[PDB]
Amino acid sequence: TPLVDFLMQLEDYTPTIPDAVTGYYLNRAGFEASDPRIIRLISLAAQKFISDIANDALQHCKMKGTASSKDRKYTLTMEDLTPALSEYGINVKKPHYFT
Amino acid sequence: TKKKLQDLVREVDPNEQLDEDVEEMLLQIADDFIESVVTAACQLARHRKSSTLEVKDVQLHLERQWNMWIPGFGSEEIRPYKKACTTEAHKQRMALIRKTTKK
Amino acid sequence: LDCHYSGHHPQPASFCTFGSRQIGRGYYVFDSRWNRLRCALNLMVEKHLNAQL
Amino acid sequence: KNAPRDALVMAQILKDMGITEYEPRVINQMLEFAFRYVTTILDDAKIYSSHAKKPNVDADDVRLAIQCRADQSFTSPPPRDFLLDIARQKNQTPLPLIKPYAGPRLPPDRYCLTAPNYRLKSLI
Amino acid sequence: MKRVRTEQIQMAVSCYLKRRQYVDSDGPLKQGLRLSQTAEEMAANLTVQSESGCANIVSAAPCQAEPQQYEVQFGRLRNFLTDSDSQHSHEVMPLLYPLFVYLHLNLVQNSPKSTVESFYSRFHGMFLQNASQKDVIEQLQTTQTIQDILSNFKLRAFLDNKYVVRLQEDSYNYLIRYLQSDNNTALCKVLTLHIHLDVQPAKSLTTICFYAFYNTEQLLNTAEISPDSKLLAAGFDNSCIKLWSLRSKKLKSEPHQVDVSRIHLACDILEEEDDEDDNAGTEMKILRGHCGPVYSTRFLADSSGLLSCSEDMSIRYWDLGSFTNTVLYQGHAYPVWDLDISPYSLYFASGSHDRTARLWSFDRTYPLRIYAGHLADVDCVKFHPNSNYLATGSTDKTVRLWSAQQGNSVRLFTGHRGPVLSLAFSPNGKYLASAGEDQRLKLWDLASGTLYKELRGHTDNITSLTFSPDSGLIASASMDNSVRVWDIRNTYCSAPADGSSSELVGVYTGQMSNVLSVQFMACNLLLVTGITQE
Amino acid sequence: XXXXXXXXXXXXXXXMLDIPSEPCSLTIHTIQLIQHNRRLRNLIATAQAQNXXXXXXXXXXXXXXXXXXXXXXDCKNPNAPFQIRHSDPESDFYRGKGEPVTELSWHSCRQLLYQAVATILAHAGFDCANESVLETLTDVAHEYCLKFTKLLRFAVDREARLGQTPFPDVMEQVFHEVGIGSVLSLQKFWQHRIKDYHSYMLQISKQLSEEYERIVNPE
Amino acid sequence: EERRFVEIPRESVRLMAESTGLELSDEVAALLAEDVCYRLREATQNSSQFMKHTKRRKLTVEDFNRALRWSSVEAVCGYGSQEALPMRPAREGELYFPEDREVNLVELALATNIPKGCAETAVRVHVSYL
Amino acid sequence: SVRQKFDHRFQPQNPLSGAQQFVAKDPQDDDDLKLCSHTMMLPTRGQLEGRMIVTAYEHGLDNVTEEAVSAVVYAVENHLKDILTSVVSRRKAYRLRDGHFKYAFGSNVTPQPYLKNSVVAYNNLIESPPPPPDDAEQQAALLLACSGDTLPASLPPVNMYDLFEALQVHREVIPTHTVYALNIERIITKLWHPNHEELQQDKVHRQRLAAKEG
C-alpha cells in the first residue's frame, strides 16, 4: 500500500548475516566498519547470493526421483549442489575414497 | 575496405576516443592474439594427421579456450551429449562404503 | 611398505612456453619482428664469406 | 597405521619444502587438488580424442589436453629474457634533477588521492 | 657428458675476453686491478663516455627533402621569442646566434644556390651590434662551396667543435615546451649534433631497549621505529597498520576533506565535523586502505610520513598530518615483497614476486628504472649509504649489486646454500652483509667482490641485520628467538663455544617468542621488537 | 624511567548478541508445523479409510507469532490515505552514523557464517544435509564476500583519484558489476522471497489446521 | 649425490580415472603421475613463499588458497575449520574415507551462541642492561 | 642434519628448453607479413592469409581452407571489441537487459536510488510492456531530472592508466596467459603523467595566450 523511499525501507530489512561478519570482511579491504547502511547492503547481497543457490538445489532435488510422496525428509547431497554451483563457473569434483 | 581501431570503437561507443599510446598497445595485443590462435589451430590440425587447416579446428580452439562462438559457419561439429556412465568397480566400492556406513 | 620414489626430480609432460622462438645460438625472441632482418643479415654474411676465398 | 599412503606422500612433500608444522586439513585440501586436476585433464582428453575420430584415448590426446590446460591455468611470471628487453627500453628515459628540498616533494595534486566527488555537496 | 671443472670456467672466461678484445694479446695476469676509483676520476670517466657518441641521430633528424623549411622553422622561432614578455625569453635568447651560424653552415654543405642567399638576407641583420660576433657573421657572406668552410680558419673550430650555452632548468623546459609544440626537426638536429646546452639546478657496555606486543594472535607481521625515535608502526596479516606514540604526547589528526577508508552515498554532505575537540588526542591510530596482508612499513628520513607495501601489489604513502593514505604508486602486477628508502629520502625501491625490482621517486607515480636479471623472487633490497648502488637478495641464492642511475648489474656473489632474507651495508661503505635460510652470515668485500668473513652459530632462519654507526658491531636476529651481536674488528678473543669464536660477543635469548626487528641509534643503543607470552 | 608507555585498562577482561530476523525464524517454524500436520493427516485418513486407536491425537498448537510482527498485524492501520512516511535527514541511520562493530577473529567469524548458511538452508526448505556440503557452501560464501569487497576497494580508489564516479555512487557501480541490476532490485527481491513467502506459509498452515479440525471432531 | 622424491603410485591415478569411466593403459598412468607430482610441488613452493614473509611457522589453508589464486587456479572449498578430520578404514583394510555425518539443520538454525570478541593490542616497554 | 636441507627443494622447469627452433627461408620481396604494429590498421582478409600460410608452413601443412581466414578475422575484431567494452565500462554508466546485455553507454538515465521520486519512476519507466513525441519528450526530461547530475563533468581521452586498471580488474577478457603476461608488462612501462615543471610551463603558456588575447 505504501511506497516510502528506499532508505526508509532499508531500515526494516533485517539480514540473516550478522553485522560483525560484514565488518570483518570490510576491514580486510581497508574500510572503517561503522556505517550501518553499507553493512546492511553488503549482507543483503550475500544473502541473495546464497538464497539463489539454495532454491536451485531444492528444485534439482525435487526433480531427481520422478519416474520408476509429499511427506518426506528433504536432505542435501553433493549431487544436488554440483549442478546448482556450476551455474556460476564453480566446478566441484571431490574424491570419495583414498589409499 | 579499410579498417581502423576507431571503426571498432564506434560499434561500442561513438562518443569515446583514445590516446595514441593506447592505439599502439591495442594493435600490439592483436598481433599477439593472432600469433597464439593460429599456432593453436595448427597444432590441433597436426593432431589428426590432416593435410589442410580446416575451419573446424579454429572453431574447436576458440570454443574451448577463449569461449568464443562465431555464428555463421554451420553446425557440422557439435558433439552429441552422452550418458557418461560409470564402471563396475567404482559402483562396487561405493556400495561397499555405503554398507560399512550402514552398520 | 615403502613409498615409491624415483632418482630424479619430476618434469611436466607439457608446459607453457611464452610463444618464444630461438633465433640463432643463445638468443630468444617473442615477437616475430626480426624475421626479415635476420634473413637479410644471414645472406649478407654468407656472401661476405664466399668472397674471401 | 591410521593414515593411507597418499596422506604420507603429501606430508613428505610438505616436509621436503621445509614446512615444520601446519593445520591438519591442509592435506585433505591437497588431495582434493590432485583429484580435481586429474579428473579435468581426463575429461579434456576425451573431447580432444573424439575430435580425432578414434577409439579409446592414448598418450597424444592426454599430452594435448595438458598443453591446453597449462596455456591457461597453471601460470607464473614471464622469464628473464623478456624482462631484460622491456628494461632496456625503459631505462633510456631521464631521471629528475636533484635540488635542495625542505623534505621530499610529493607529486602534483591532480594525480593524488585528494579529490572529493563533485556530485556531493559541501556545507559550512 | 660430465660436469665442467673449476678451471674450465676461467678458460672459457679468458676465451671470451680475448675474442671480444678486452685484454692484450697475451696472458693479462698484470690486468685485473681497475676494480674501484675515486670521485674525481669517476667524473672523468663519465665525462669521457658522455662525449664518446651521439645520443640521437636516426630519429632526431628530418627525412623529408624540402629545403624551404629551414626558413620557416627559424622564422617561427624568432617570432615566438620576440613577442614573449617573460624572464625566460631573456635566458633563451643567446641560442639564436649558434643556431643561425650552424643552420647556414649545414645549408652550404647541401643546398642549391637559391636557398642560401634568401636565408642570409632574411635574418642576417641582428648579429651586428656585438663586436666579437660581427667578424664571422660578415665572413660567412663570402661562402658558397665546401672548400670555403675547410679553407677558412674561423669556420673550422665551429665545424669541428660544439658551442656552449648555459641555462637553468626552467629555461630549458621553456625551450622544450616550444620544441614539442610542432615540427621543429631541423632545429632538433642542430641542437643534437652541434650545440651543447648545459643545465644545472637553480638556486661502558651497550644497553638494549625492547618492545613486546601481547594481543596479536598470529597476525603481526613487521614493525619499525622512526629515526628520531618518536613513533612505532606495525603491519598485520589482516590488512591494517597501527601506529603508537613513544613519547608522552598524543596523536591527533587535523582537518581533511577526503578519506579513502570511507564510503559515501549519493545522498551525503561533505561537512567537517565540529564535535572533535572532545577527542583532543589519543595514543594509537589505525591506518586503513590496503586490501591484502602487509609486508613492510618504512619511515622517511625526517619522520614526516610513512610508506608501505602489501600483497595487493600496491605501495601507499601515509601522511602523518592526518594519518591517511594520500598517494598511491601502482607499478606491479604481482605481490610486492620488500621496500626500502634512500638515505636522504630521494628514492625508494621495491622487490616483487615478478622477479624484478623497480626504482621510484617520491614525486612521480610510476616506476623509473627496472633491474631485471634475477631468476626468481626478489625478497630483499637495500640502498647503499651514498645512495648510488643497490643490493637485492633472491630465492635463487644469489645477490646482485646494481648501478642506480644506469641500471645494470655490476656484481654477482654466489655461495649461499638457500634463499636469502636480509642485507646490510656498513656506514663506511666498504662491506655488505647477507643472511638466509642457510644459517650462515657472510660479509662481502665490495671492491674485490669476494668473501671477506663468515660467521656461524645461529640454528634457524636469520631474518634481520644491522650495523653500528661506526661499523663496529653487526647484530642479527634469527628464527630461534635469539639476538646475537658480533664484532669483526681486529680485537681477537678465545671463546670457541661453537664454530665462530672470537667474533661472537653477546647473546640474548630471554623470555621472547618470534623476533621482529633490530636497530641502532646514536650511542650504543639497540632497539628490538617482537612478541612474547608468559 | 622509561616512561610514556601504555597504561593498562581497568576493565581489560571478557573481550555481543545480534537480533535474528523474525519472519525467517517464524517461516522455519511454520514449515515444521505444516510437515507435522501432514503426517498426522495422512496417518489418520489412511487408518480410518481402512476401518489409542480410538483416540485421535489432538489439536497440535500454533507457533506463537513473533513479538513484533504480532503488534504490527498499533491502531493506525497503516493502509490509510493521505499518509506520507519519509526518513528524517537528521536521523543517525540516514546520516550513516554509528559505532565500529565488534572485532572478532577468523576462528569465530567462520562459525558465525556457518550458522548463517545453515539458517539460509533451513529457510530454503531443506532440514538436514551432509557436513561436506555445508562446510563447502561456507567457503563459497567466503570467496564471494572477498571479491565483493575488493571490487569496492578498487572503485573507491579510482573515485578518490579522478574525483567522480560513473554511477551516482560506488555502491551502485559494484552492484552493477556483480550481476545484480541495481540497489532498487533488493526491494522486489525482499517482497517476493520473504514477505510473500511468509504470508503463503501462514495461509497454508491455517488451511491445513482447519482441515484437521474438521476431521478430528465431525459436527 | 643420491636423492629421492616420493611419487604417487600408478594405482592411485588409475583409481581416480576409474570414477571418470575410463580404463587407462600403462605409460599414461606414469605420465599423469609425474605431471601431478610436479604441479603439487609447484603449488607447495608458492604457498610456502607467502608464509615466508609473516614470521610464523604453521601453514594455514588460507595460504594455500592465496597461492592458488595468484597462480590463476580455482580454489578449494571446505577445509577451513581449524579442527582435525579423522580418516576411517573400511572393513577389508585398504580403502579409507572421511567421516561425513548427517546434520539436522533446524537445531543449528534455532540456537543462540553469542561470540566473544577479541582484545585490543598493546605494547609494554622493557629495558635491560648487559 | 643441515647439509641435506636444500637438496629436495623445487626446481622449476625452464620455459625456454621447449622453445621453438627458427629456420631461415629465402629472403624474397613477396614473402612479407605486415604485422599490425607496422601498419597502424587492422589486417585485411588478404594480408592475414600471407602470415597464416607462413606460420602453417613451420608446422608441416599445405594451405588454409579459406574459411579459417574469415573466422580468424571475425574473432580478432570480436576480441578487440571485448577489450574496448571492458575499458569503457569503468568510466560510464550503462543499462542491462536480461541481466547481462549492456547497451546504452551514455551517462544519462541513472536514476539516483535515494529519492522518493526516483523510486516511483523506476517501477514504471523501467518495466515497459514488451510513443508520441510530446510524451517521449516529457519522459526524457523526467529521466534526466531523476539522474541527479545537475552539473555533469567529462573525462579526458582514454590513456594508459585506464587500460591498466581495466585489465587488472576484469582479467577474463584475456584468458590465455601468454597474451596477458607479455602485454601487461609492456603497458606498465608506458605509464606517464606530466611532472611539476611541465605544469609550470603550461601555466606560463596560458598566461601568454590570455595576454595576447587581453
Swiss-Prot record, chain A:
Motif [KR]-[STA]-K motif, chain ranges: 69-70
UniProt similarity note: Belongs to the TAF10 family.
Protein source organism: Homo sapiens (Human)
Subunit details: Component of the TFIID basal transcription factor complex, composed of TATA-box-binding protein TBP, and a number of TBP-associated factors (TAFs), including TAF1, TAF2, TAF3, TAF4, TAF5, TAF6, TAF7, TAF8, TAF9, TAF10, TAF11, TAF12 and TAF13. Component of the TATA-binding protein-free TAF complex (TFTC), the PCAF histone acetylase complex and the STAGA transcription coactivator-HAT complex. The PCAF complex consists at least of TADA2L/ADA2, TADA3L/ADA3, SUPT3H, TAF5L TAF6L, TAF9, TAF10, TAF12 and TRRAP.
Record PTM N6,N6,N6-trimethyllysine, positions in chain: K70
Modified residues (Allysine): K70
The record's note on its domains: The [KR]-[STA]-K motif is specifically recognized by the SETD7 methyltransferase.
Name the UniProt record assigns to this protein: Transcription initiation factor TFIID subunit 10
High-level lineage: Eukaryota, Metazoa, Chordata, Craniata, Vertebrata
Its biological purpose: The TFIID basal transcription factor complex plays a major role in the initiation of RNA polymerase II (Pol II)-dependent transcription. TFIID recognizes and binds promoters with or without a TATA box via its subunit TBP, a TATA-box-binding protein, and promotes assembly of the pre-initiation complex (PIC). The TFIID complex consists of TBP and TBP-associated factors (TAFs), including TAF1, TAF2, TAF3, TAF4, TAF5, TAF6, TAF7, TAF8, TAF9, TAF10, TAF11, TAF12 and TAF13.
UniProtKB/Swiss-Prot annotation, chain C:
Post-translational modification: Proteolytically cleaved by caspase-7 (CASP7). The cleavage may be involved in SCA7 degeneration: the isoform fragments may exert distinct toxic influences that could contribute to selective neurodegeneration. Sumoylation decreases the aggregation propensity and cellular toxicity of forms with an expanded poly-Gln region but has no effect on subcellular location or interaction with components of the STAGA complex.
Coiled-coil region: none
Domain of life from the UniProt record: Eukaryota
Stated role: Acts as a component of the SAGA (aka STAGA) transcription coactivator-HAT complex. Mediates the interaction of SAGA complex with the CRX and is involved in CRX-dependent gene activation. Probably involved in tethering the deubiquitination module within the SAGA complex. Necessary for microtubule cytoskeleton stabilization. Involved in neurodegeneration.
Family: Belongs to the ataxin-7 family.
Quaternary structure (record): Component of the SAGA transcription coactivator-HAT complex, at least composed of SUPT3H, GCN5L2, TAF5L, TAF6L, SUPT7L, TADA3L, TAD1L, TAF10, TAF12, TRRAP, TAF9 and ATXN7. The STAGA core complex is associated with a subcomplex required for histone deubiquitination composed of ATXN7L3, ENY2 and USP22. Interacts with SORBS1, PSMC1 and CRX. Interacts with TRRAP, GCN5L2 and TAF10. Interacts with alpha tubulin.
Protein name (Swiss-Prot/TrEMBL): Ataxin-7
Organism of origin: Homo sapiens
Gene behind this protein: ATXN7
UniProtKB/Swiss-Prot annotation, chain E:
Pfam families: TFIID_NTD2, WD40
Organism field: Homo sapiens (Human)
Record CDD domains: TAF5_NTD2 (cd08044), WD40 (cd00200)
GO cellular component: cytoplasmic ribonucleoprotein granule; nuclear speck; nucleus; SAGA complex; transcription factor TFTC complex
The WD repeat ranges on this chain: 215-254, 289-328, 331-370, 373-412, 415-454, 457-496
Family matches, as PROSITE patterns: WD_REPEATS_1, WD_REPEATS_2, WD_REPEATS_REGION
Protein name: TAF5-like RNA polymerase II p300/CBP-associated factor-associated factor 65 kDa subunit 5L
Superkingdom in the source lineage: Eukaryota
Subunit and partners: The PCAF complex is composed of a number of TBP-associated factors (TAFS), such as TAF5, TAF5L, TAF6, TAF6L, TAF9, TAF10 and TAF12, PCAF, and also PCAF-associated factors (PAFs), such as TADA2L/ADA2, TADA3L/ADA3 and SPT3. Component of the STAGA transcription coactivator-HAT complex, at least composed of SUPT3H, GCN5L2, TAF5L, TAF6L, SUPT7L, TADA3L, TAD1L, TAF10, TAF12, TRRAP and TAF9.
PANTHER family hit by this protein: TAF5-LIKE RNA POLYMERASE II P300_CBP-ASSOCIATED FACTOR-ASSOCIATED FACTOR 65 KDA SUBUNIT 5L, TRANSCRIPTION INITIATION FACTOR TFIID
Keywords per UniProt: Nucleus, Repeat, Transcription, Transcription regulation, WD repeat
UniProt key word Transcription regulation: yes
Compartments it resides in: Nucleus
Gene Ontology molecular functions: transcription coactivator activity
Family the UniProt entry places it in: Belongs to the WD repeat TAF5 family.
InterPro entries named among the record's database cross-references: G-protein_beta_WD-40_rep, TFIID_NTD2, TFIID_NTD2_sf, WD40/YVTN_repeat-like_dom_sf, WD40_repeat_CS, WD40_repeat_dom_sf, WD40_rpt
Curated annotation (Swiss-Prot), chain G:
Entry keywords, A to Z: Methylation, Nucleus, Phosphoprotein, Transcription, Transcription regulation
Keyword Phosphoprotein: yes
Function description: Functions as a component of the PCAF complex. The PCAF complex is capable of efficiently acetylating histones in a nucleosomal context. The PCAF complex could be considered as the human version of the yeast SAGA complex. With TAF5L, acts as an epigenetic regulator essential for somatic reprogramming. Regulates target genes through H3K9ac deposition and MYC recruitment which trigger MYC regulatory network to orchestrate gene expression programs to control embryonic stem cell state. Functions with MYC to activate target gene expression through RNA polymerase II pause release.
Positions spanned in the full protein: 5 to 134 of 622
GO molecular function terms listed in the Swiss-Prot or TrEMBL record: DNA binding; protein heterodimerization activity; RNA polymerase II general transcription initiation factor activity; transcription coactivator activity
Disulfide cross-links: none
Family from the record: Belongs to the TAF6 family.
Known partners and oligomeric status: The PCAF complex is composed of a number of TBP-associated factors (TAFS), such as TAF5, TAF5L, TAF6, TAF6L, TAF9, TAF10 and TAF12, PCAF, and also PCAF-associated factors (PAFs), such as TADA2L/ADA2, TADA3L/ADA3 and SPT3. Component of the STAGA transcription coactivator-HAT complex, at least composed of SUPT3H, GCN5L2, TAF5L, TAF6L, SUPT7L, TADA3L, TAD1L, TAF10, TAF12, TRRAP and TAF9.
Record's keyword annotation contains Lyase: no
